[PDB]
Amino acid sequence: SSYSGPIVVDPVTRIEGHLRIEVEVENGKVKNAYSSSTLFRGLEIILKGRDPRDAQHFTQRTCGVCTYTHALASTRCVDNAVGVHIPKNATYIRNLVLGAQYLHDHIVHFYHLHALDFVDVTAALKADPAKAAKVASSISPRKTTAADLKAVQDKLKTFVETGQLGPFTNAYFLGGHPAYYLDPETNLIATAHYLEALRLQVKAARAMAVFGAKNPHTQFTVVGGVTCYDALTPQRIAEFEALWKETKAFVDEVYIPDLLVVAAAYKDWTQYGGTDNFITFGEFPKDEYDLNSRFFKPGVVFKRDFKNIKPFDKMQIEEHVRHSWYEGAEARHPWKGQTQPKYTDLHGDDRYSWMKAPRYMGEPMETGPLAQVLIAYSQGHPKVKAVTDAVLAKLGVGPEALFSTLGRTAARGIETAVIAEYVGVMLQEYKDNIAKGDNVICAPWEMPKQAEGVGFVNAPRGGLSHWIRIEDGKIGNFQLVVPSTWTLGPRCDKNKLSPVEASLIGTPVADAKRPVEILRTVHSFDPCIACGVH
Amino acid sequence: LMGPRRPSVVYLHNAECTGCSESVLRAFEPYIDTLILDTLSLDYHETIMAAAGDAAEAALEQAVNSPHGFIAVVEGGIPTAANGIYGKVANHTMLDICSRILPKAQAVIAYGTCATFGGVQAAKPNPTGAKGVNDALKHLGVKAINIAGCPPNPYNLVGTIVYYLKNKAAPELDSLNRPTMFFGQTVHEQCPRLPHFDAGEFAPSFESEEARKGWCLYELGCKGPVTMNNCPKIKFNQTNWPVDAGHPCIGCSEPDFWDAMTPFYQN
Ligand code: SF4
Numbered sequence A: 001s002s003y004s005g006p007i008v009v010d011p012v013t014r015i016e017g018h019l020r021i022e023v024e025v026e027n028g029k030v031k032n033a034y035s036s037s038t039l040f041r042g043l044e045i046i047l048k049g050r051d052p053r054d055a056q057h058f059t060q061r062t063c064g065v066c067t068y069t070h071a072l073a074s075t076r077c078v079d080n081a082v083g084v085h086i087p088k089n090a091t092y093i094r095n096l097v098l099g100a101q102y103l104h105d106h107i108v109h110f111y112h113l114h115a116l117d118f119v120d121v122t123a124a125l126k127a128d129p130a131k132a133a134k135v136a137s138s139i140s141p142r143k144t145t146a147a148d149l150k151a152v153q154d155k156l157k158t159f160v161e162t163g164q165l166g167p168f169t170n171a172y173f174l175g176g177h178p179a180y181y182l183d184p185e186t187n188l189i190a191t192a193h194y195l196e197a198l199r200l201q202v203k204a205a206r207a208m209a210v211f212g213a214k215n216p217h218t219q220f221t222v223v224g225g226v227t228c229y230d231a232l233t234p235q236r237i238a239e240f241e242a243l244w245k246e247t248k249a250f251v252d253e254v255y256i257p258d259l260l261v262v263a264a265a266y267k268d269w270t271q272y273g274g275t276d277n278f279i280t281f282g283e284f285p286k287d288e289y290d291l292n293s294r295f296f297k298p299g300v301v302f303k304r305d306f307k308n309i310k311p312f313d314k315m316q317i318e319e320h321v322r323h324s325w326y327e328g329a330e331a332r333h334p335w336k337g338q339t340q341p342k343y344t345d346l347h348g349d350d351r352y353s354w355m356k357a358p359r360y361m362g363e364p365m366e367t368g369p370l371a372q373v374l375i376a377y378s379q380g381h382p383k384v385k386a387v388t389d390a391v392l393a394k395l396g397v398g399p400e401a402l403f404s405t406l407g408r409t410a411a412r413g414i415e416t417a418v419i420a421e422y423v424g425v426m427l428q429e430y431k432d433n434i435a436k437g438d439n440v441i442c443a444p445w446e447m448p449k450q451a452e453g454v455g456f457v458n459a460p461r462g463g464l465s466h467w468i469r470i471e472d473g474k475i476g477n478f479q480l481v482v483p484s485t486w487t488l489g490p491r492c493d494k495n496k497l498s499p500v501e502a503s504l505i506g507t508p509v510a511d512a513k514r515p516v517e518i519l520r521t522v523h524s525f526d527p528c529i530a531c532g533v534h
Numbered sequence B: 001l002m003g004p005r006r007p008s009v010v011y012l013h014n015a016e017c018t019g020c021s022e023s024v025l026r027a028f029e030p031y032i033d034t035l036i037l038d039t040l041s042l043d044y045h046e047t048i049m050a051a052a053g054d055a056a057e058a059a060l061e062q063a064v065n066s067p068h069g070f071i072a073v074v075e076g077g078i079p080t081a082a083n084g085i086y087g088k089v090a091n092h093t094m095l096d097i098c099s100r101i102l103p104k105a106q107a108v109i110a111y112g113t114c115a116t117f118g119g120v121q122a123a124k125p126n127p128t129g130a131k132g133v134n135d136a137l138k139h140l141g142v143k144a145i146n147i148a149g150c151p152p153n154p155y156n157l158v159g160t161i162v163y164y165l166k167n168k169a170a171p172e173l174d175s176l177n178r179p180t181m182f183f184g185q186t187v188h189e190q191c192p193r194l195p196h197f198d199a200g201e202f203a204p205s206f207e208s209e210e211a212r213k214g215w216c217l218y219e220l221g222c223k224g225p226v227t228m229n230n231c232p233k234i235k236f237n238q239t240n241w242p243v244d245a246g247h248p249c250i251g252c253s254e255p256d257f258w259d260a261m262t263p264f265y266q267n
């Protein structure tokens, strides 16, 4: 019973945006893969000729999952082009909203996007809630009782008995599936926490609105700093702090224990989904013009050589189009970027995606939590080292296990835990600065007629860069190079498979009609196709 | 995926950023778990549904052809240039998908300025020929209730659906097909800075002491006077809205706002 032939997954659900995955499988294992992004909007085309101050409002609509991140990148980019050094408090406030974005985003990813690849929600109905409560209480300082879990089981039983399965309709686990391994009790714990996370994420997102106006799509950044004078008040800081503390408690007592329990049950997933090269830009600066002042530092690693981390040279980025639906075949550095759509249909002239293919010194680079965590570890980051070692010790695996779909999923939790604690450190520094009498949040600036600028964000999915050429005081060129473009773009003009495509080779597929193993690896990268294509 | 009991919702994603989907996850009293388990049956939604690929397509077919009927909620503009090829799902263009499904719905809600009016990808020069739902599908007689904003207040989506389920009809709509109960007032007439506007007290810059003191943002570009929405009343996330965060309104619930309201920092 092992399949040879093609599999297509279109739509890939439980991602942001519109992705088609194609694989060739030989004897039950994937032998070849294509990452095809099937929506184009053309925001770079739309920006031409406009006021550079308007860019962040357009580019934030690249994506509402990773909301704020593109407003921050465009504002850093135009700040950089005009040469303004924003006030200390603007850096603190921008950093605090970004930290809150990471917690919201990664909690929703693990429960609401990834977990249905590994949790059979309907098997939770078979569970013994008393046993389940014992297990939940053994993995977390939070005590869970049988009645807590029975309430969830009773709600789910009414739901399933209605015959209206809603978002669970035709799930790959219905009826049982050989690649779903959890016992009923663990499925009930995860299901309970899925539901809990639906309400907790409201609070995690509200934390961004306390300073940033609203979520989704914040509205508090300007060239030169931020606008939110109310963010200086003790009442708004207390409101943020209480939402942060409750979100952190959920990360530490709910998400990370669940991640570890699921990881332990799926330890064979240390064998699939590895990649070779990693790039990260660093995040949470003390100095807006020095990436090495960031809490996480930038770095480049090739062929898993973490003993030789290379500096990040922004001039070594080129975006390929040979296998993409754009004119021609010439790769471009983004300050010389081109966005010239030309559709040839699937595999026409060997083109199969609306994403460009970014390459660093000609290589395909994974970015995102696994790159941020592994490079920061390798740089001696003491918080990352402490959490990552504890995770490895708890799972009983060595460091090599991180180079996998399981490891990538674990790294997303590691980064969430480390950022959740660092948000408290930033908050205290911000409080201390206000107490010194610094109440400034925006600095004045002047628009140059000609300039180049770049802004760097390490977003929840990895290294984000926005690149502007100002001509006559207007946008002459504006190029976004986004984390999912790195990770999920197609092949380049050297025919190198992208990180997601290479990571799929070797994936076993138990049931070609229900190819959850492909989803596990694809979802571990947390794809965002609106991001990748814009 | 549904049957009798809870009303069936089919949620479609066209040319969109998923910010409108995220806004619905911020639903408060009722929260999204109540909405998905008790109020409604969410029978297709690519962001959160378990099924993928062929199984997801079969889930869609089963929902759309159900004898109990369904309500469609649509996020994103429809790309119409080059015969719709700039957006496809399951290798069908979004224009074809929406042309086949939306005329079968009992009611259609276009949720977000992209679905209502075309949105960010329809800004000049509109390379993909993106259109709002009613514009793109006029010829098929589709008349979606438009709940505008980028993204809208999720209070306004739930309130519209509750009204429809109670009354089996749309609420009163304005000339842009938006509910008057949410879009009947300008942002400005509800704004706490209105007394400063009246006194001609405007912040000249974001770094100014006038901005610190909460003076009106009109000279810094605020579009509150030309924008219909309930932001100052309901707020977002139960806590804030753009002008109370010291930033001007950019007009995001109005048609073509990307071109009509720019430059965002000028009036
Ligand atoms: S209306 Fe705004 S938030 Fe909603 S899909 Fe469009 S760009 Fe995104």
Ligand code: SF4
Residues within 6 Å of the ligand: B187, B188, B189, B191, B192, B193, B194, B195, B197, B215, B216, B217, B218, B222, B223, B224, B225, B243, B248, B249
């Ligand atoms: S800040 Fe904007 S909405 Fe408020 S009074 Fe001034 S112009 Fe009107």
Ligand code: F3S
Residues within 6 Å of the ligand: B149, B150, B187, B227, B228, B229, B231, B241, B242, B243, B248, B249, B250, B251, B252, B253
């Ligand atoms: S920008 Fe949009 S969210 Fe409200 S304040 Fe203005 S209509």
Ligand SMILES: [Mg+2]
Residues within 6 Å of the ligand: A044, A356, A479, A480, A481, A482, A533, A534
């Ligand atoms: Mg780009």
